Amino acid sequence: DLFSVRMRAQKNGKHVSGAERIVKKEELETAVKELLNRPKEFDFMNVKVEKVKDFEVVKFNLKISTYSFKSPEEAREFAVKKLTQEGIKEEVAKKAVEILSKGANPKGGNMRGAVLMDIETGERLEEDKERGVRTIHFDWKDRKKVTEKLLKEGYTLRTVDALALTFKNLFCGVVAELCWSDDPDYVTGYVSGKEIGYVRITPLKEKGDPLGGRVYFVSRKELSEIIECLTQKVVLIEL
Numbered sequence: 532d533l534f535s536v537r538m539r540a541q542k543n544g545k546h547v548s549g550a551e552r553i554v555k556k557e558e559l560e561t562a563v564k565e566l567l568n569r570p571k572e573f574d575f576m577n578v579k580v581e582k583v584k585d586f587e588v589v590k591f592n593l594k595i596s597t598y599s600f601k602s603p604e605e606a607r608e609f610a611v612k613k614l615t616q617e618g619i620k621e622e623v624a625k626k627a628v629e630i631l632s633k634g635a636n637p638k639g640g641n642m643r644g645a646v647l648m649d650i651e652t653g654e655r656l657e658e659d660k661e662r663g664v665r666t667i668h669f670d671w672k673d674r675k676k677v678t679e680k681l682l683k684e685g686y687t688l689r690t691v692d693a694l695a696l697t698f699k700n701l702f703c704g705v706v707a708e709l710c711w712s713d714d715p716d717y718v719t720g721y722v723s724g725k726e727i728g729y730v731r732i733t734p735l736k737e738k739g740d741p742l743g744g745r746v747y748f749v750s751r752k753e754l755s756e757i758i759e760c761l762t763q764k765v766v767l768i769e770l
């Protein structure tokens with residue numbers, strides 16, 4: 532008997548915060564209390580609690596590494612190199628980089644979902660190409676434990692969330708992911724794949740730059756099951 536808890540908050544019409552937790556009824560209040568207090572300030576908040584029908588547990592099996600470079604250019608070139616080791620060929624991967632660099636949303640600014648890409652035409656397969664695909668319905672099977680472990684190991688709370696997200700993205704047949712934050716104060720991002728693991732890369736963008744986002748690399752041959760798994764399948768993740 533599990534429940535999905537999905538929170539979103541705004542201030543002056545602009546999104547300020549969001550989170551999902553998947554927990555037993557006995558933890559339902561704890562999760563709702565955590566998400567209620569998450570935003571610093573807000574005008575409006577919606578919390579959507581939904582009982583889970585089907586779900587699957589998966590064990591986390593990615594290896595984490597971290598690399599630091601002197602410049603966004605050095606960092607982005609290294610991201611391209613490590614994508615290359617996931618079978619992506621250098622050309623597609625470098626298109627992903629400028630998209631997030633130049634501005635992922637066509638009409639300008641940041642999408643709040645991911646770019647889809649085939650590993651060949653390098654074109655954006657996402658439906659609403661101004662919002663993109665949002666991966667949802669995933670969580671750490673024991674978030675409090677995992678968060679303690681990874682924070683002690685030196686990672687941040689953003690790592691904790693980003694890890695669980697990619698491992699679902701990859702479990703759903705995304706082959707590799709490119710991501711950095713749109714927060715202008717957080718310049719660590721990552722490249723991710725079933726072979727390269729979770730490769731954290733720092734300065735993927737200049738401080739003060741407010742353009743971020745994700746790009747998922749996928750087989751257009753498979754796009755149907757992936758969007759299904761990304762947006763509808765319910766996955767807990769244990770260590």
Ligand SMILES: O=C(O)CCCCCC(=O)O
Pocket residue numbers: 687689690691693710711712713714719720721731743
């Ligand atoms: O593991 C990290 O520290 C990198 C997480 C990238 C930031 C994800 C985001 O805020 O969109």
